[PDB]
Ligand binder design. Structure first.
Ligand SMILES: [Zn+2]
Ligand SMILES: [Zn+2]
Ligand SMILES: [Zn+2]
Lengths: 206, 206, 206
């Protein structure tokens, strides 16, 4: 079998698409990448990740971002039966439409999940086992381990404390701000540096 | 290696069993299905799922149900050392005994887990990253993302709010009811429709 | 591809290392084990687990311990750019340094994760979907399903209630004690017995 493959023909997908992966990205052999996916340069996709763009599409992962072990990306249907685009399930980023948009320099840590409709802004850390669904996470944010954002917009530069499940815009508006002395303030740039280097190192083993 | 395989011989499993999978089910090549498992028609098993019936057995997945990416099904021992059935670890559904019973038209969403002893009634949605263990989830229920049911019975037609961990029968008795205007009221039938079509589409690629 | 493999050359890893696995351990073909890892005797590594010692290293798993389906072990960098050991990210156990140390007779249940720097004492159960990061879990402990220990030390013989996220030493100091009548008091020794037997049974299929 191939772990990088096209999505299947369905009522909402007349024409199958294969992933477009930059030559500098590393897809582990035990990761799965299916369908209408764009993977940017220097991205590291770890073992057991599953990026599956067969329902809601497309799923984009920007440059120097990392999709860690066991992370799932998938999305709610973006085209219904009759060929109609379901706009509630589509996010818009820089004038383009996506089912899931992961920006540049974003870390999706181990066992986290981003389910479309969703967008994750540049230089944000999505912590271990965290969860994002029907939400827009701004740039320079931090979702600590086991936090979750569902149905909300997380303003730029804010963090979600470990274990907190954010389901209302009123709650997302009062999240705390990332400051220089906040414990995860430098976490994402370290992770990004590491993962870019791991992608290169692992590419030299293939 | 084969990803669909028999369980190993152990003190509690004198005779190995191989999965019984309907020809219309789709098992992704990167899913794992081991042992005394029954998979029904039109079921979709996604990448990185692990259905492992080697301890507690059998594990059943009914018709038109879906086991999404990274979902784990496994169960506590159902036969002890001396060949004795441990009745506390066995669930009974329609006069038959199972370690894990997943009914028909049930969605086990991405990264959720159902650990036996457990039963999940027809047309219920088990949300992303949710958890069911030592529990009986009725039919037409909804476990929102990151909810959990442990050691309880979830009455038919109720939902568990995102992030809520239900560990007592008193709590399960007062869960809210699914109504037409509840946000996840039509989620499972949409997921089921989609996953049945994905199973067929993916079967046409094999 | 090989699922058991060396870590890549990076700025912090001049010399690649391959896993040292006891002949009596069983590594499922759909598990991934990468880099500077030591796996002890009679250990069972299940489908979809990912043990990845490519950043923080080494990762040790002691005798008769089990790494269940979808469990991730990984760790923060232990050597920085300039070849300097980052002592805050290194744990010390019996006079030896590790990125992640999993002791003997420890169960890492399905979908849990232990992220270095971290140590987990002998005969402790890390429950389904639980999370340990920047913490030291003592021996004879129980992390119930969906519990978490972050940045703390969990004293020997204590348990963390299902769903509880422990982030402060004040909180970890007041956790409840495991007693004979506590519900998970015999869980780990049962799991260990089972998993040792599964490792042997599965080794007889290879
Ligand atoms: Zn989905
Ligand atoms: Zn289990
Ligand atoms: Zn990591």
């Amino acid at each position: 079998f191939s772990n990088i493959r096209e999505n299947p023909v369905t009522p909402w997908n007349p024409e199958p698409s294969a992933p477009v992966i930059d030559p500098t990205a590393y897809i582990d052999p035990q990761a799965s990448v299916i369908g209408e996916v764009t993977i940017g340069a220097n991205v590291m996709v770890s073992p057991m990740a599953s990026i599956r763009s067969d329902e809601g599409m497309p799923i984009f992962v920007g440059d120097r971002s990392n999709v860690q072990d066991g992370v799932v990306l998938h999305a709610l249907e973006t085209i219904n039966e009759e060929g109609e685009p379901i706009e509630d399930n589509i996010v818009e980023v820089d004038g383009k439409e996506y089912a899931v948009y992961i920006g540049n320099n974003v870390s999706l840590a181990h066992q986290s999940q981003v389910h479309g409709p969703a967008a994750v802004g540049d230089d944000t850390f999505i912590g271990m086992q965290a969860f994002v669904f029907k939400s827009k996470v701004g740039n320079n944010c931090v979702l600590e381990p086991r936090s979750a954002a569902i149905g909300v917009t997380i303003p730029d530069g804010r963090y979600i404390p470990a274990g907190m499940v954010v389901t209302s815009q009123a709650e997302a508006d009062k999240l705390p701000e990332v400051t220089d002395d906040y414990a995860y303030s430098h976490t994402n740039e370290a992770v990004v540096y590491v993962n870019v280097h791991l992608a290169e190192g692992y590419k030299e083993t293939s």
